Amino acid sequence: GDDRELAILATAENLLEDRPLADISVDDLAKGAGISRPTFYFYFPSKEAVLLTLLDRVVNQADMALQTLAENPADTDRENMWRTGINVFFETFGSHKAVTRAGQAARATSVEVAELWSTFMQKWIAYTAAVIDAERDRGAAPRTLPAHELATALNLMNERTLFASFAGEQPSVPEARVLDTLVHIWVTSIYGE
Amino acid sequence: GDDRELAILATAENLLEDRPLADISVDDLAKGAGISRPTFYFYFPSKEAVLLTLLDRVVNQADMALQTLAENPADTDRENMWRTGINVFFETFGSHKAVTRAGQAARATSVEVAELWSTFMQKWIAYTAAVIDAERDRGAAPRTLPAHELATALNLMNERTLFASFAGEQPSVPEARVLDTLVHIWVTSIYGE
Ligand SMILES: O=C(CCC1CCCC1)Nc1cccc(N2CCCCC2)c1
Numbered sequence: 190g191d192d193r194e195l196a197i198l199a200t201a202e203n204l205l206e207d208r209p210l211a212d213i214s215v216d217d218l219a220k221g222a223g224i225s226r227p228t229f230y231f232y233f234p235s236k237e238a239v240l241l242t243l244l245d246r247v248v249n250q251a252d253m254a255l256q257t258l259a260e261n262p263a264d265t266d267r268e269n270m271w272r273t274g275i276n277v278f279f280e281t282f283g284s285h286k287a288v289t290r291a292g293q294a295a296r297a298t299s300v301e302v303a304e305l306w307s308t309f310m311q312k313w314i315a316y317t318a319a320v321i322d323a324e325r326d327r328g329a330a331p332r333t334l335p336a337h338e339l340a341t342a343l344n345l346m347n348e349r350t351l352f353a354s355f356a357g358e359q360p361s362v363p364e365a366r367v368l369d370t371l372v373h374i375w376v377t378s379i380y381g382e
Numbered sequence: 383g384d385d386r387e388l389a390i391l392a393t394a395e396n397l398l399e400d401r402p403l404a405d406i407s408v409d410d411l412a413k414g415a416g417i418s419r420p421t422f423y424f425y426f427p428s429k430e431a432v433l434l435t436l437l438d439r440v441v442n443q444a445d446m447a448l449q450t451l452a453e454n455p456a457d458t459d460r461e462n463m464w465r466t467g468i469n470v471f472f473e474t475f476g477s478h479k480a481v482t483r484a485g486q487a488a489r490a491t492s493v494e495v496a497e498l499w500s501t502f503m504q505k506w507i508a509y510t511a512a513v514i515d516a517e518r519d520r521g522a523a524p525r526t527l528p529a530h531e532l533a534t535a536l537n538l539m540n541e542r543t544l545f546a547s548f549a550g551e552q553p554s555v556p557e558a559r560v561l562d563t564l565v566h567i568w569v570t571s572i573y574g575e
């Protein structure tokens with residue numbers, strides 16, 4: 190039950206590593222999961238719903254990892270506080286590149302995939318702006334741009350730049366340099382007058 | 383000749399304002415341009431080639447406007463030097479939102495559209511890194527990140543953030559705030575130690 194479902198999810202994650210969702214058939218996922226095609230349609234309405242579920246799991250893993258950090262302050266300077274938080278996203282999506290890639294590609298065709306990405310980006314932006322404001326209240330950061338606008342651009346930058354690096358797009362920051370690049374731009378833009 | 387071609391281009395730009403390329407037919411473009419369908423196939427092999435041509439024109443207009451700025455230094459401080467340069471892209475693509483949107487969407491299906499966007503981003507990144515390096519040689523900017531990595535992230539940020547704002551995506555920086563938001567992040571990340 191729960192286990193035929195996980196088999197179909199693990200198969201789809203596996204196959205997405207080698208080819209696009211468009212090149213993967215329901216029969217492929219059924220055969221990989223060791224079930225028939227009509228049995229597959231019992232657990233999922235379509236191969237699109239499988240990707241939605243995979244994406245939902247990755248996004249909620251990032252989200253829960255960030256909540257965990259937010260509840261327990263790492264004991265360290267501000268540059269490292271940001272680095273640790275951006276790193277949740279670098280490690281989480283970077284450990285699931287195929288789902289991240291197919292999930293981003295599906296934004297163009299799936300309203301539920303577009304709304305999932307949008308809900309969670311709104312959450313992460315609101316958290317980012319809340320930390321910047323806490324920093325300006327403390328007198329640790331200057332009052333420059335509106336915190337929510339700054340947070341929005343920084344989060345969009347990370348979405349686009351992490352994604353280019355994970356894809357090895359041309360152009361992209363190499364994956365082994367992208368964290369340091371992003372933390373530099375977040376710290377100078379949040380703390381710089 | 384040149385004029386039946388321009389008619390088909392202007393029609394396609396017009397129709398893209400109201401609907402996606404997928405909802406636009408060759409007959410639509412022919413009727414709008416006042417020609418028959420086989421005559422259309424004389425000037426363009428497909429509606430996809432029409433979008434490629436539209437995108438190529440927008441991208442080269444930005445590119446030529448930036449070259450023009452680069453050849454004639456605006457007489458002003460550094461914050462304003464960056465603002466004027468980012469503004470070429472904000473005004474150029476922002477005056478052609480429908481083509482920008484369809485052109486970005488076509489990256490997923492067209493190799494020639496993906497290569498056009500990639501060639502020009504590489505050029506603009508190399509120019510951005512060359513100006514940062516000139517600034518560090520002058521002693522006006524500190525030697526922090528590798529200039530080409532910093533340029534890459536800043537350009538990716540602009541591509542993603544300008545585009546969200548032009549689309550009115552949720553989330554996005556409002557279009558009337560996006561320039562100021564971007565110039566802040568470029569100046570603090572280039573000049574901040
Ligand atoms: O990376 C960030 C910044 C998060 C903040 C850092 C500390 C507090 C929150 N935000 C973000 C938001 C939406 C999507 C994405 N990506 C989606 C495609 C794969 C790469 C990451 C990242």
Ligand SMILES: O=C(CCC1CCCC1)Nc1cccc(N2CCCCC2)c1
Pocket residue numbers: 448464467468471475482502503506509510536537538540541542544545
């Ligand atoms: O906006 C920039 C920064 C350019 C630098 C600013 C001064 C020197 C060059 N770069 C850039 C690169 C590729 C695509 C895009 N966009 C593509 C989608 C619509 C919005 C803009 C922008």
